[PDB]
Amino acid sequence: EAHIQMKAAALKSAQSRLFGLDGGISTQEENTERHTTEDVSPSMHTLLGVKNM
Amino acid sequence: EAHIQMKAAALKSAQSRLFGLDGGISTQEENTERHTTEDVSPSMHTLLGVKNM
């Protein structure tokens, strides 16, 4: 009885977790797009549909 | 994907030309006109219709 009471007091209400933080860190997708000196900007190749007025 | 992106970056917007400068150089017509010592000048045979006054 004493040992079981001691075990219950020591364990308290501890709940086991099966997993920690997942080791797969990357969530985005790799950027495979080219980048040439003809690009209007580092993020846009052209401004094709743009109308000045 | 990487190979296609590399090809697109390398080719850029190169446009093919089917022809270069045409090899036919002469554009004028050959001068077949005679030249005699009776000619008033190297370019005029006579001055037929000319009136002095």
Q: What is the DSSP string of A1-53?
A: -HHHHHHHHHHTT----S--S-S----S--------TT-SSSS-S--TT----
Record the resolution, in angstroms.
Answer: 2.4
What gap in Å lies between CA A25 and CA A4, rounded to an integer? 43
Degrees, nearest 5: CA angle A24-A25-A29 = 100
Dihedral of alpha carbons B3, B6, B10, B13, sign: positive
What gap in Å lies between CA B6 and CA B4, rounded to an integer? 5
Contact A34 B2 (CB under 8 A): no
Which tokens is A22 given?
Answer: 């997942």
Contact B5 A38 (CB under 8 A): no
First to last CA, chain A: 89
A36 neighbourhood in chain B, CB within 8 Å: 9, 12
Count Cα neighbours of A11 within 13 Å in the Cβ-side half-sphere.
9
**Residue B37 carries which side chain, given as an amino acid letter?**
T
Tell me the count of A-B CB pairs closer than 8 A. 13
Q: Which residues does a chain break follow in chain A (C to N more than 2.5 Å)?
A: none
Q: What approach was used to elucidate this structure?
A: cryo-EM
What gap in Å lies between CA B24 and CA A5, rounded to an integer? 111
Taking only Cα atoms into account, the Rg of chain A, rounded to an integer number of angstroms, comes to 30
DSSP state of B51: -
